[PDB]
Each structure stands twice: as structure tokens, then as C-alpha cells.
Design an enzyme around this catalytic site. Structure first.
Site, PDB file in Angstrom:
ATOM      1  N   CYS B  42       0.831  -1.244   0.000  1.00  0.00           N
ATOM      2  CA  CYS B  42       0.000   0.000   0.000  1.00  0.00           C
ATOM      3  C   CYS B  42       0.844   1.263   0.000  1.00  0.00           C
ATOM      4  CB  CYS B  42      -0.908   0.016   1.227  1.00  0.00           C
ATOM      5  SG  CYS B  42      -2.102  -1.336   1.210  1.00  0.00           S
ATOM      6  N   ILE B 271      -4.850 -28.022   3.720  1.00  0.00           N
ATOM      7  CA  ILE B 271      -4.509 -26.873   2.884  1.00  0.00           C
ATOM      8  C   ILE B 271      -5.460 -25.704   3.146  1.00  0.00           C
ATOM      9  CG2 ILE B 271      -4.123 -26.013   0.545  1.00  0.00           C
ATOM     10  CD1 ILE B 271      -3.459 -28.734  -0.393  1.00  0.00           C
ATOM     11  N   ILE B 274      -5.754 -17.960   1.981  1.00  0.00           N
ATOM     12  CA  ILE B 274      -6.045 -16.662   2.600  1.00  0.00           C
ATOM     13  C   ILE B 274      -5.671 -15.540   1.642  1.00  0.00           C
ATOM     14  CG2 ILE B 274      -5.650 -17.592   4.907  1.00  0.00           C
ATOM     15  CD1 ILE B 274      -2.966 -16.217   4.960  1.00  0.00           C
ATOM     16  N   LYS B 426     -26.370  16.333  17.525  1.00  0.00           N
ATOM     17  CA  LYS B 426     -26.987  15.280  16.722  1.00  0.00           C
ATOM     18  C   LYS B 426     -26.096  15.065  15.513  1.00  0.00           C
ATOM     19  CE  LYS B 426     -31.148  17.284  16.522  1.00  0.00           C
ATOM     20  NZ  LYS B 426     -31.385  18.144  17.726  1.00  0.00           N
TER      21      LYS B 426
HETATM   22  C1  LIG Z   1      -0.146  -0.590  -5.370  1.00  0.00           C
HETATM   23  C2  LIG Z   1      -1.136  -1.271  -4.404  1.00  0.00           C
HETATM   24  C3  LIG Z   1      -1.818  -0.442  -3.441  1.00  0.00           C
HETATM   25  C4  LIG Z   1      -2.747  -1.088  -2.489  1.00  0.00           C
HETATM   26  N1  LIG Z   1      -3.397  -0.282  -1.566  1.00  0.00           N
HETATM   27  C5  LIG Z   1      -4.266  -0.867  -0.661  1.00  0.00           C
HETATM   28  C6  LIG Z   1      -4.952  -0.068   0.323  1.00  0.00           C
HETATM   29  O1  LIG Z   1      -4.736   1.307   0.390  1.00  0.00           O
HETATM   30  N2  LIG Z   1      -5.822  -0.702   1.230  1.00  0.00           N
HETATM   31  C7  LIG Z   1      -6.032  -2.109   1.202  1.00  0.00           C
HETATM   32  O2  LIG Z   1      -6.675  -2.640   2.046  1.00  0.00           O
HETATM   33  N3  LIG Z   1      -5.357  -2.906   0.230  1.00  0.00           N
HETATM   34  C8  LIG Z   1      -4.482  -2.255  -0.675  1.00  0.00           C
HETATM   35  N4  LIG Z   1      -3.839  -3.052  -1.612  1.00  0.00           N
HETATM   36  C9  LIG Z   1      -4.200  -4.466  -1.669  1.00  0.00           C
HETATM   37  C10 LIG Z   1      -3.426  -5.331  -0.676  1.00  0.00           C
HETATM   38  O3  LIG Z   1      -2.065  -5.094  -0.855  1.00  0.00           O
HETATM   39  C11 LIG Z   1      -3.822  -6.809  -0.855  1.00  0.00           C
HETATM   40  O4  LIG Z   1      -5.183  -7.045  -0.611  1.00  0.00           O
HETATM   41  C12 LIG Z   1      -2.860  -7.722  -0.076  1.00  0.00           C
HETATM   42  O5  LIG Z   1      -1.530  -7.514  -0.487  1.00  0.00           O
HETATM   43  C13 LIG Z   1      -3.275  -9.199  -0.264  1.00  0.00           C
HETATM   44  O6  LIG Z   1      -2.407 -10.090   0.410  1.00  0.00           O
HETATM   45  P1  LIG Z   1      -1.965 -11.441  -0.401  1.00  0.00           P
HETATM   46  O7  LIG Z   1      -0.974 -12.229   0.609  1.00  0.00           O
HETATM   47  O8  LIG Z   1      -3.150 -12.181  -0.811  1.00  0.00           O
HETATM   48  O9  LIG Z   1      -1.218 -10.910  -1.768  1.00  0.00           O
HETATM   49  P2  LIG Z   1       0.245 -10.147  -1.825  1.00  0.00           P
HETATM   50  O10 LIG Z   1       0.458  -9.262  -0.681  1.00  0.00           O
HETATM   51  O11 LIG Z   1       0.265  -9.385  -3.258  1.00  0.00           O
HETATM   52  O12 LIG Z   1       1.373 -11.322  -1.716  1.00  0.00           O
HETATM   53  C14 LIG Z   1       1.276 -12.449  -2.559  1.00  0.00           C
HETATM   54  C15 LIG Z   1       2.691 -12.958  -2.845  1.00  0.00           C
HETATM   55  O13 LIG Z   1       2.689 -14.343  -3.321  1.00  0.00           O
HETATM   56  C16 LIG Z   1       3.724 -14.422  -4.282  1.00  0.00           C
HETATM   57  N5  LIG Z   1       3.390 -15.549  -5.142  1.00  0.00           N
HETATM   58  C17 LIG Z   1       2.351 -15.664  -5.984  1.00  0.00           C
HETATM   59  N6  LIG Z   1       2.409 -17.007  -6.585  1.00  0.00           N
HETATM   60  C18 LIG Z   1       3.495 -17.639  -6.054  1.00  0.00           C
HETATM   61  C19 LIG Z   1       4.056 -18.956  -6.264  1.00  0.00           C
HETATM   62  N7  LIG Z   1       3.430 -19.868  -7.225  1.00  0.00           N
HETATM   63  N8  LIG Z   1       5.213 -19.326  -5.549  1.00  0.00           N
HETATM   64  C20 LIG Z   1       5.851 -18.451  -4.652  1.00  0.00           C
HETATM   65  N9  LIG Z   1       5.297 -17.139  -4.438  1.00  0.00           N
HETATM   66  C21 LIG Z   1       4.134 -16.770  -5.155  1.00  0.00           C
HETATM   67  C22 LIG Z   1       3.716 -13.142  -5.037  1.00  0.00           C
HETATM   68  O14 LIG Z   1       4.869 -12.908  -5.813  1.00  0.00           O
HETATM   69  C23 LIG Z   1       3.486 -12.138  -3.924  1.00  0.00           C
HETATM   70  O15 LIG Z   1       4.682 -11.580  -3.435  1.00  0.00           O
HETATM   71  C24 LIG Z   1      -2.969  -2.491  -2.508  1.00  0.00           C
HETATM   72  C25 LIG Z   1      -2.279  -3.335  -3.471  1.00  0.00           C
HETATM   73  C26 LIG Z   1      -1.352  -2.686  -4.426  1.00  0.00           C
HETATM   74  C27 LIG Z   1      -0.581  -3.560  -5.424  1.00  0.00           C
HETATM   75  S1  LIG Z   2     -23.542  23.136  23.506  1.00  0.00           S
HETATM   76  C1  LIG Z   2     -23.808  22.128  22.017  1.00  0.00           C
HETATM   77  C2  LIG Z   2     -25.113  22.426  21.299  1.00  0.00           C
HETATM   78  N1  LIG Z   2     -25.527  23.819  21.406  1.00  0.00           N
HETATM   79  C3  LIG Z   2     -26.901  24.145  21.742  1.00  0.00           C
HETATM   80  O1  LIG Z   2     -27.746  23.317  21.654  1.00  0.00           O
HETATM   81  C4  LIG Z   2     -27.272  25.630  21.911  1.00  0.00           C
HETATM   82  C5  LIG Z   2     -28.774  25.940  21.960  1.00  0.00           C
HETATM   83  N2  LIG Z   2     -29.571  25.181  20.973  1.00  0.00           N
HETATM   84  C6  LIG Z   2     -30.999  25.492  20.788  1.00  0.00           C
HETATM   85  O2  LIG Z   2     -31.439  26.490  21.263  1.00  0.00           O
HETATM   86  C7  LIG Z   2     -31.794  24.662  19.720  1.00  0.00           C
HETATM   87  O3  LIG Z   2     -31.115  23.471  19.394  1.00  0.00           O
HETATM   88  C8  LIG Z   2     -32.155  25.505  18.451  1.00  0.00           C
HETATM   89  C9  LIG Z   2     -30.876  26.058  17.834  1.00  0.00           C
HETATM   90  C10 LIG Z   2     -33.091  26.658  18.827  1.00  0.00           C
HETATM   91  C11 LIG Z   2     -32.860  24.587  17.409  1.00  0.00           C
HETATM   92  O4  LIG Z   2     -33.697  25.231  16.447  1.00  0.00           O
HETATM   93  P1  LIG Z   2     -33.211  25.138  14.845  1.00  0.00           P
HETATM   94  O5  LIG Z   2     -34.388  25.732  13.851  1.00  0.00           O
HETATM   95  O6  LIG Z   2     -31.974  25.906  14.685  1.00  0.00           O
HETATM   96  O7  LIG Z   2     -32.897  23.522  14.529  1.00  0.00           O
HETATM   97  P2  LIG Z   2     -34.167  22.432  14.459  1.00  0.00           P
HETATM   98  O8  LIG Z   2     -33.839  21.131  15.418  1.00  0.00           O
HETATM   99  O9  LIG Z   2     -35.407  23.078  14.877  1.00  0.00           O
HETATM  100  O10 LIG Z   2     -34.294  21.904  12.883  1.00  0.00           O
HETATM  101  C12 LIG Z   2     -33.216  22.233  12.013  1.00  0.00           C
HETATM  102  C13 LIG Z   2     -32.992  21.302  10.801  1.00  0.00           C
HETATM  103  O11 LIG Z   2     -32.300  20.004  11.114  1.00  0.00           O
HETATM  104  C14 LIG Z   2     -33.150  18.917  10.637  1.00  0.00           C
HETATM  105  N3  LIG Z   2     -33.861  18.258  11.753  1.00  0.00           N
HETATM  106  C15 LIG Z   2     -33.968  18.707  13.004  1.00  0.00           C
HETATM  107  N4  LIG Z   2     -34.720  17.741  13.762  1.00  0.00           N
HETATM  108  C16 LIG Z   2     -35.063  16.678  12.902  1.00  0.00           C
HETATM  109  C17 LIG Z   2     -35.783  15.486  13.115  1.00  0.00           C
HETATM  110  N5  LIG Z   2     -36.316  15.188  14.436  1.00  0.00           N
HETATM  111  N6  LIG Z   2     -35.983  14.566  12.033  1.00  0.00           N
HETATM  112  C18 LIG Z   2     -35.481  14.844  10.814  1.00  0.00           C
HETATM  113  N7  LIG Z   2     -34.759  16.038  10.601  1.00  0.00           N
HETATM  114  C19 LIG Z   2     -34.560  16.955  11.676  1.00  0.00           C
HETATM  115  C20 LIG Z   2     -34.083  19.504   9.631  1.00  0.00           C
HETATM  116  O12 LIG Z   2     -33.876  19.197   8.281  1.00  0.00           O
HETATM  117  C21 LIG Z   2     -34.267  20.927  10.002  1.00  0.00           C
HETATM  118  O13 LIG Z   2     -34.584  21.803   8.952  1.00  0.00           O
HETATM  119  P3  LIG Z   2     -35.938  21.573   8.027  1.00  0.00           P
HETATM  120  O14 LIG Z   2     -36.647  22.841   7.892  1.00  0.00           O
HETATM  121  O15 LIG Z   2     -36.933  20.464   8.736  1.00  0.00           O
HETATM  122  O16 LIG Z   2     -35.480  21.040   6.527  1.00  0.00           O
HETATM  123 CL   LIG Z   3       1.551  -1.467   3.217  1.00  0.00          CL
END
Ligand SMILES: Cc1cc2nc3c(=O)[nH]c(=O)nc-3n(C[C@H](O)[C@H](O)[C@H](O)COP(=O)(O)OP(=O)(O)OC[C@H]3O[C@@H](n4cnc5c(N)ncnc54)[C@H](O)[C@@H]3O)c2cc1C
Ligand SMILES: *SCCNC(=O)CCNC(=O)[C@H](O)C(C)(C)COP(=O)(O)OP(=O)(O)OC[C@H]1O[C@@H](n2cnc3c(N)ncnc32)[C@H](O)[C@@H]1OP(=O)(O)O
Ligand SMILES: [Cl-]
Ligand SMILES: Cc1cc2nc3c(=O)[nH]c(=O)nc-3n(C[C@H](O)[C@H](O)[C@H](O)COP(=O)(O)OP(=O)(O)OC[C@H]3O[C@@H](n4cnc5c(N)ncnc54)[C@H](O)[C@@H]3O)c2cc1C
Ligand SMILES: *SCCNC(=O)CCNC(=O)[C@H](O)C(C)(C)COP(=O)(O)OP(=O)(O)OC[C@H]1O[C@@H](n2cnc3c(N)ncnc32)[C@H](O)[C@@H]1OP(=O)(O)O
Ligand SMILES: [Cl-]
Ligand SMILES: [Cl-]
Ligand SMILES: [Cl-]
Ligand SMILES: [Cl-]
Ligand SMILES: [Cl-]
Ligand SMILES: [Mg+2]
Ligand SMILES: [Mg+2]
Lengths: 437, 437
Positions: B42, B271, B274, B426
Site C-alpha cells: 500500500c 490446505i 487466505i 446530533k
Molecule cells: C499498489 C497497491 C496499493 C494497495 N493499496 C491498498 C490499500 O490502500 N488498502 C487495502 O486494504 N489494500 C491495498 N492493496 C491491496 C493489498 O495489498 C492486498 O489485498 C494484499 O496484499 C493481499 O495479500 P496477499 O498475501 O493475498 O497478496 P500479496 O500481498 O500481493 O502477496 C502475494 C505474494 O505471493 C507471491 N506468489 C504468488 N504465486 C506464487 C508462487 N506460485 N510461488 C511463490 N510465491 C508466489 C507473489 O509474488 C506475492 O509476493 C494495494 C495493493 C497494491 C498492489
Molecule cells: S452546547 C452544544 C449544542 N448547542 C446548543 O444546543 C445551543 C442551543 N440550541 C438550541 O437552542 C436549539 O437546538 C435551536 C438552535 C433553537 C434549534 O432550532 P433550529 O431551527 O436551529 O434547529 P431544528 O432542530 O429546529 O431543525 C433544524 C434542521 O435540522 C433537521 N432536523 C432537526 N430535527 C429533525 C428530526 N427530528 N428529524 C429529521 N430532521 C430533523 C431539519 O432538516 C431541520 O430543517 P428543516 O426545515 O426540517 O429542513
Molecule cells: Cl503497506
């Protein structure tokens, strides 16, 4: 039904909107004690950093716009001060006029969330961050006083986001925390990159440190150190907004939260609670859970809307506690039970550190993934991940795994999307599975 | 047992290595027909692109090193030419001497993978890409001929990676493909950004185009066009390396692949097969599947290792076909049955297009997520995502969902990790669920 909602933000405005999607006839009213509805809570640190500069991202609606669009009435600067559940009304203080009145309801939905804790000093230079008013105040103070040096107190995710944003704005923050337990949702030994990132940028920090005294801009610390600061942002935890609920028949736990069933119902008929105020249970284990995050607020909002106006067979299945924060170049995410809860289980820990993507592939960075599992059933209890790249992805995948009761061993079977920029033929998640046993 | 492995790369070297982990006594020998073991398949496009400079990145082991570390014997330039299955030997050709010999086995493991197809032209300027020898040859040819104009034939994902790398190396590629079905693992309409990216960089392409004749550097095409090219890289598919297997008792399919059972056994005792050579079935539907990617090679390698030397209750559960490629700025990911396989089901499609993360957070981009589900049982059949950001995350989450035959409706329950740089409260995934009703 006549619907009253308390709190007009992440849980409350969302829920009201979701109800309107299903039900075009019911009257819906939301009370909000502060200035703004629908502000973007999670955007606030970034507004401060001038990363988010368009006001339209800072809040979604004004009450006028919300009404025009959805025919939902929102009263800002209206504080609910009591729930009269036996007569089905709430007592509301109009803060502009200082007059109170009763509002009746057929259904009541509580989404009051939490408030920022304060250190309690008498300081004009100190601010907390919970809403858009706070955000505006901080921005204005920075400009009015040409703020350069800022003290950031507390090392939870909010404070860390605020620190990063102050730095990016061009300011010079210093971080302190009362202990070494920074970013507490993450495993203690996985947080070092926070300190590394501070060091790399020469951002000062002191752990096991506290504000001792304040005299104008002169701050005296527990360590004995004395420093001058232009501004202080305190991120020292939150507390539930539930005092107004205490006199009612609604059951509160000893910490002030509201336990709810899987329909987000309280113990009192016709009263629901959602968002940070509500406690439930884990989805994957038989333990209580509270997860004061946006996902839960939004999910509960949808479930309550179905309960009231839609398919009432739709029920919550519990929390997983998925959470995340960015700090400079790093991400810290976790899901499942807390580190302190692991002891209720017989557990084992497995971990791997590997490139986030193809080792031969550029821009790579080491990602640390850790998973805890229950030895009795091989189920996943907790997962945590830290790195510059890919942590959110791994934790979301693990959240979905835990939703499906996956065992740690089954992680070998997770089929990842692989190409060099993204992962490995055996992903970190797969490696956790292989390494388990 | 005496173990013989055929192929020393993704499946083969990995499987041998995995067996050694479990068994230090058995003799293990691998035969590899080409020069290198354990090359990075990754990586190869990137070696071409000079993105991977250090050739140490393209090769993980030599046979000497493999024996030193693992006591496994690997014989390169040794091609297995026949399987004598009744006597339990393989016939091996030593390609250096051209002498053959037999190697006995107790167990045989086939991982020979696939070879590149060729168009069969008589051309010294044309290259395919499958191993490191090929990569060396391409690199050498580029230098020796000062190649500039290159014709890239084929539009599969690897060819696309090769094209991008040639472009970045400074060469001028043109892409052709015999049909319009580029990047075929992705939904056809969602592949447009590939063509957009080509157009943006003025890289010429012609689809439904083929080489007609080659006369030196003068290439004549089906269209009638005549062009001069310095080099051609052909990516015109692959074929199974199974010719050496045909005389044995092992059953091959009509295309030359090896069907295996879930133990990766062939029809012949002792076997195994994963990697790319092996065919199996899908996990989520009852259909044959072939997924010649790295994940499957590695997974099968581990399963066979357990079968032979470990826990023999460990068996394959089938493929999902998760796959992904990057092409310039975009990511293209899908999972599930292939587009052409959808017709074997009664199905519906749901989709959403939304920012990858919070709209207010910089560097956002539109992410398109699409999900197909079976109308008979609501199960997810296929998912696809395209965008600059977040596509890999969504598709990995859905792979995990499908691994559990999750339904489209249950996506509403997915608990995302939310902070602004990452998602929404909320998520797109949740929205699919909400929109499915
Ligand atoms: C560029 C890139 C970015 C990614 N980014 C993310 C991310 O941001 N988030 C996320 O969750 N996942 C990400 N992934 C995916 C993540 O890396 C995979 O899901 C993870 O690596 C899977 O683990 P794995 O062991 O199945 O495969 P791998 O980690 O790819 O390892 C498998 C290994 O087995 C080896 N192999 C295969 N066949 C054989 C064989 N016959 N004999 C010996 N060795 C073999 C391979 O050469 C390889 O090294 C990314 C993958 C890539 C390539
Ligand atoms: S200290 C941390 C929080 N601070 C305080 O609470 C300070 C004081 N707060 C208050 O006095 C009240 O909370 C006030 C600000 C008077 C609430 O009145 P508002 O007019 O400002 O807000 P409303 O709750 O009346 O409604 C605003 C919009 O939010 C959505 N919504 C509220 N409630 C619901 C529910 N029960 N279900 C669905 N949606 C809800 C709405 O979309 C609403 O606007 P709409 O006109 O209905 O589209
Ligand atoms: Cl990684
Ligand atoms: C700066 C910051 C950054 C965050 N970042 C993230 C993150 O990145 N990810 C994540 O998932 N979560 C994050 N969160 C947390 C997320 O915002 C909460 O989980 C979500 O807001 C909870 O929804 P809620 O409706 O319960 O509370 P809120 O959205 O805070 O709304 C509750 C509202 O109720 C009002 N209220 C309270 N009591 C009363 C009363 N008696 N009468 C009238 N009104 C009342 C409040 O004034 C407030 O406006 C962050 C929070 C903050 C402050
Ligand atoms: S196109 C994309 C894929 N293509 C390729 O894979 C190219 C060719 N690949 C191969 O030749 C083999 O895959 C090689 C490169 C030889 C490696 O074989 P293995 O997959 O068996 O891994 P290693 O022996 O080289 O060990 C590396 C690290 O991973 C840990 N590890 C492997 N297998 C396990 C198992 N079953 N259980 C627990 N851990 C496992 C190793 O211990 C090792 O960790 P380190 O701390 O880095 O040593
Ligand atoms: Cl927000
Ligand atoms: Cl009452
Ligand atoms: Cl490791
Ligand atoms: Cl024979
Ligand atoms: Cl078979
Ligand atoms: Mg009373
Ligand atoms: Mg290592």
C-alpha cells in the site's frame, strides 16, 4: 396540551422545537431567566478567542424570530421561582418589572441546566463563563482595560478551551488548578500532553495552586507567590439550577439533580426533566449516570417530544458518557464509566500506542488507545484515547461497540477502513482485541 | 507441524509470523517467487510520488532478518509450480538455478495473491504496479527518460493514488478509463469530487477511452485522438495467481479463486487459502463476497494461525467490504454490499449532507453520508461517505454497527463524541436515524 418549558437553550429550546415538528396546535411557552435564548454554549470559548466573530453563530434566535418561525412563545428575563405542582402552575418572576404571576400547564418540561461556581472573592476583574451575557462581559472587559495578563483558574475542558482561545487572541494566560487532577474525564496518566503543549508555547502553569487573596490587580496565591493580573476567569465547577424546585413534590437527589425514568419523567405526573439537571443510568452497566453534555440534552429533547406528541414507545436506553476535548494539537476522548467507577468491577486494562495511520505515511502521530473490560463477561467498561490524530474516530467506534454489547475479544473482528492516510490493516482497535486475554 | 506458506507478503508473512507467536517449535518455511518479502504493497504509489523517500519504509524484512527475529525460513526467487496434495509436498522452482525440488508439509497455507493485468501491447514505455520490483523499475524509468507526460490507464483507487503521486512528484499525468465507472467501490454519483479535483488542477481525463495502438511514444486512442506520452502506467485490473494450483485436487471457481470455509480451509485436508486468492461470504447478508484488501489478508492470517496452533474455535464471520481511498483533498469510503448487489434486496436510501463539524468552527466542509437499508428488516445493507473531513470516522462507526446487524432506526441512539472541532450534538449518523421514518 399546553406546554411550559423552563430554560430556553440546549435542552429546552431544542425540545420545544422538536415538539412543534410533531404538533402544530399546542400552545408552547418557554421561560428563560437571562437575556438570551438559544445561545451556542459550546461556541462561547471560541467567541472569546475571536475565532467565532459572527454574532449569528453565537445565538440562533431572538424570541421574536423564534415566534415568527415556530409559533413558540419565549419570555426572556423571566425566572421560574417555584413549581406549584398540585395546582399545575409555575410561579414566574418578570425580572424587568419585578412582578410575579402564575402560568398554568398541562405538561411541564424542566431544562434549567447548571450555573458556574464562584470563588466568592469581591473582585471586579473576575469572571465566570456560562452564557452569552458572560461572554459579552468578558469581551468588553478585555477591550475596556487593554487586558494582557489573564489568570485562568481550573483545568477542566471548559477552562482549557478558554485558555487556548485567550492565547490565540494574543493574550498571555497563566493556568492554575487546586490539584494535579486536570481534565478529569480522561485517565490521569493520559493527560501529560496538556502540560507538554503549555510548555511548548511557554504558557505558565502551576498545579496544587489556589488564589489566596485579591487586592485590586494584586493576586496572592496559596504557594505564597504574588502576581499582578489584568483579568481572572474562574472555571471552578458548576452546580445544578434546582433551588427553585425544592419546595415542590419533585424528587431531587442529595446533590440537587432530578432522577428520571427512561421517558425522562420525574416522579410527578406530567413533569419531565432533561439536560444537565437530569440523572439516569448507564446503558452498558447497571449503575447511575449523569452526563452533562450536549448529546444528552439533544437526545432527551427528542425523546420527550416523542413522549408528548409522537411515538411514546420511544425510550432512553441509558448513557455511555462519550466525551471529547481539543487542546492545541491534541485530542482527548473517552467513553464508558469514569476512572473512579472502575473499582465497582473486577476489570483488566489493555492498551496500544501506534501511529494513527501508516507508519511510512507522512504527518503521522502516536495515538494512545486504552480499553478496560469486565473479567466476568468480557464486556467493555471504558475506553480512552489521546493523540494528535484519530482519537475521535477510535472512541466513536468503541461507543458503537459498547452500544452493541461487544466483548473486548470481538474487537479483533472489527473491519476497519484501511488505506495509508487512515489506519492500519490491523487497526489499534483490532490490536486491543488481540492483546486482551 | 511442518508448515509451508506460499507467498511472503500481506497474507503469507503475516500468517507465518502469527503462527510463530503461538508455536516456537514447528518448522515454518515460506516460498516467494519474486525478490522481496514483506514489501509495503500500500506504500508503493507513495514511493513513486517520493512521498516515501526512505526505502526502509517500503520493505519491512529481509529473509535473514526474518529468521533472526522469528526463526522462520523464507526463500525468495523460489516459485511454487505445483501442489502434490496427495503426497503432501509442493514442487518448487529455484529461479536462480532453474532446478526444481519438492518440499513436504503437514500444513500448507496459500497466500499467492493476484498479479496485475496487462493490455498486451508491445511497448517498452508501459508499466504495471504490484510489487517493489515494479516500483523500482518505474522510478528508474522516470529518471532515465526524464519523464514528464504520463498516461495513467484505469480509474480504480490504486491508479488514482498513482496519478496523484505522479502529479505531486512534478509530472503531468492524463487519466483515461474504459468506462465511466471510476473508483467503482463508491456510489457513482458520489465520485464527482474526483473529477472536480482533476479539473481544479487542470489534469486531463477522458472516460470511455482506450488505447488503440502504440507506436513508440505515439499513442492512438479509441476516440481517434493521437498523443505523445513518455510513459504509461496500466491499472487495468488483476487476476488470481492460481495457475500453479490447477493440476491439484483444490477446487477453484470459474474465475480462478479458491472458495474457503470459515476456517479458511480449502476442500483439501491440511490446505488453507487466505488473502486475495480466497473467496468467502458477507457477514451481514447471505451472499458471496470477495474483498481483496489488506484487512482481510491480516484477519485471515490470524484465524489460520489460531486454527493451526491456537484456539481452533476461532472462525471467520464474513466480510463487510469496508474500503476507502484519499484523492487530493477528498476521502471516499464505503461499506457493505456493492452498488450492483443492492438489486438483490428490497431497499431504501437515506442521506444527509452537513458540516463535518460544528458550523461555527473554522475549516469546516460538507460531508455527504448515505445509508441503504433492507425494507424487510430495517437492517443496514450499505453505507457511503464522501467529503474532505470525517468520512472515515462515519464509515468506521457504521462498519461496527453492521457487524452487529444494527438497524437504521437505532442510529438515533448512537452517542457521538461531541465538541465543536469534531461533530454535532446530533451527528450525521444520528440524523440518518431521524430521517429514516
Ligand atoms: C499498489 C497497491 C496499493 C494497495 N493499496 C491498498 C490499500 O490502500 N488498502 C487495502 O486494504 N489494500 C491495498 N492493496 C491491496 C493489498 O495489498 C492486498 O489485498 C494484499 O496484499 C493481499 O495479500 P496477499 O498475501 O493475498 O497478496 P500479496 O500481498 O500481493 O502477496 C502475494 C505474494 O505471493 C507471491 N506468489 C504468488 N504465486 C506464487 C508462487 N506460485 N510461488 C511463490 N510465491 C508466489 C507473489 O509474488 C506475492 O509476493 C494495494 C495493493 C497494491 C498492489
Ligand atoms: S452546547 C452544544 C449544542 N448547542 C446548543 O444546543 C445551543 C442551543 N440550541 C438550541 O437552542 C436549539 O437546538 C435551536 C438552535 C433553537 C434549534 O432550532 P433550529 O431551527 O436551529 O434547529 P431544528 O432542530 O429546529 O431543525 C433544524 C434542521 O435540522 C433537521 N432536523 C432537526 N430535527 C429533525 C428530526 N427530528 N428529524 C429529521 N430532521 C430533523 C431539519 O432538516 C431541520 O430543517 P428543516 O426545515 O426540517 O429542513
Ligand atoms: Cl503497506
Ligand atoms: C463554555 C461552555 C462550553 C461547553 N462545551 C461543550 C462541548 O464542547 N461538548 C458538550 O457536549 N457540551 C459542552 N458544554 C455543555 C453543554 O452546553 C450542556 O450540557 C448543555 O448546555 C445542557 O443543556 P441544558 O438545557 O441542561 O442547560 P443550558 O443549555 O445551560 O440552558 C439552561 C437554561 O435554563 C435557564 N434557567 C435555569 N433556571 C431557570 C429558572 N428557574 N427560570 C427560567 N430559566 C432558568 C438558564 O438561565 C439557562 O439559560 C459546554 C458548556 C459551556 C458553558
Ligand atoms: S498492503 C497493506 C498490508 N500489507 C502488508 O502487510 C505488507 C507485508 N506485511 C508483513 O509482511 C507482516 O504483516 C509483517 C510486516 C512481517 C508483520 O507481521 P505481524 O502482523 O504478525 O506483526 P509483527 O510481528 O511485525 O509485530 C508488530 C507489533 O504488533 C504486535 N502484534 C502483532 N500480532 C499480535 C497478536 N496476535 N497479539 C498481540 N500483539 C500482536 C506485536 O507484538 C508488535 O508490537 P511492538 O510493541 O511494535 O513490538
Ligand atoms: Cl453550541
Ligand atoms: Cl401546588
Ligand atoms: Cl503498544
Ligand atoms: Cl500428489
Ligand atoms: Cl468451500
Ligand atoms: Mg405551595
Ligand atoms: Mg510500538
Amino acid at each position: 396540551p399546553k406546554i411550559v418549558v423552563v430554560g430556553a437553550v440546549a435542552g429546552g429550546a431544542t425540545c420545544a422545537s422538536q415538539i412543534r415538528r410533531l404538533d402544530k396546535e399546542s400552545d408552547i411557552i418557554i421561560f428563560e431567566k437571562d437575556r438570551d435564548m438559544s445561545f451556542a454554549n459550546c461556541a462561547l470559548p471560541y467567541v472569546i478567542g475571536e475565532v467565532v466573530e459572527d454574532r449569528r453563530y453565537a445565538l440562533a434566535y431572538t424570541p421574536e424570530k423564534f415566534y415568527d418561525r415556530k409559533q413558540i412563545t419565549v419570555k426572556t428575563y423571566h425566572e421560574v421561582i417555584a413549581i406549584n405542582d398540585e395546582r399545575q402552575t409555575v410561579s414566574v418572576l418578570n425580572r424587568k418589572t419585578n412582578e410575579q404571576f402564575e402560568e398554568s400547564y398541562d405538561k411541564l418540561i424542566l431544562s434549567p441546566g447548571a450555573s458556574a461556581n464562584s470563588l466568592g472573592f469581591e473582585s471586579d476583574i473576575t469572571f465566570t463563563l456560562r452564557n452569552l451575557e458572560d461572554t459579552d462581559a468578558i469581551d468588553q472587559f478585555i477591550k475596556a482595560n487593554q487586558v494582557d495578563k489573564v489568570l485562568v483558574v481550573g483545568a477542566g475542558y471548559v477552562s482549557l478551551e478558554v485558555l487556548e482561545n485567550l492565547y490565540e487572541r494574543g493574550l498571555h494566560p497563566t493556568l492554575i488548578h487546586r490539584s494535579d487532577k486536570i481534565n478529569k474525564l480522561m485517565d490521569a496518566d493520559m493527560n501529560q500532553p496538556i502540560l507538554d503543549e503549555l510548555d511548548k508555547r511557554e504558557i505558565p502553569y502551576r498545579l496544587n495552586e489556589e488564589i489566596n487573596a485579591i487586592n485590586g490587580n494584586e493576586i496572592t496565591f496559596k504557594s505564597g507567590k504574588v502576581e499582578h493580573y489584568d483579568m481572572i476567569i474562574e472555571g471552578v465547577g458548576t452546580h445544578p439550577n434546582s433551588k427553585f424546585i425544592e419546595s415542590s413534590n419533585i424528587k431531587l437527589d442529595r446533590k440537587g439533580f432530578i432522577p428520571v425514568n427512561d421517558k425522562f419523567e420525574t416522579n410527578v405526573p406530567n413533569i419531565y426533566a432533561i439536560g444537565d439537571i437530569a440523572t439516569s443510568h448507564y446503558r452498558h452497566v447497571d449503575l447511575p449516570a449523569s452526563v452533562p453534555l450536549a448529546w444528552g440534552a439533544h437526545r432527551a429533547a427528542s425523546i420527550v417530544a416523542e413522549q408528548i406528541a409522537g411515538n411514546d414507545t420511544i425510550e432512553f436506553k441509558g448513557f455511555l458518557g462519550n466525551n471529547i476535548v481539543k487542546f492545541f494539537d491534541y485530542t482527548f476522548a473517552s467513553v464508558g464509566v469514569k476512572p473512579n467507577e472502575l473499582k465497582q468491577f473486577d476489570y483488566k486494562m489493555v492498551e496500544v500506542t501506534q501511529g494513527a495511520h501508516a507508519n511510512f505515511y507522512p504527518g503521522n502521530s502516536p495515538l494512545h488507545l486504552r480499553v478496560y473490560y469486565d473479567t466476568s463477561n468480557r464486556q467493555i467498561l471504558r475506553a480512552a484515547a489521546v493523540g494528535k490524530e484519530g482519537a475521535d474516530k477510535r472512541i466513536d467506534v468503541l461507543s458503537m461497540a459498547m452500544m452493541n454489547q461487544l466483548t473486548v475479544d470481538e474487537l479483533t473482528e472489527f473491519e476497519v477502513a484501511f488505506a495509508p492516510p487512515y489506519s492500519h490493516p490491523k487497526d489499534l482497535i483490532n490490536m486491543i482485541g488481540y492483546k486482551a486475554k
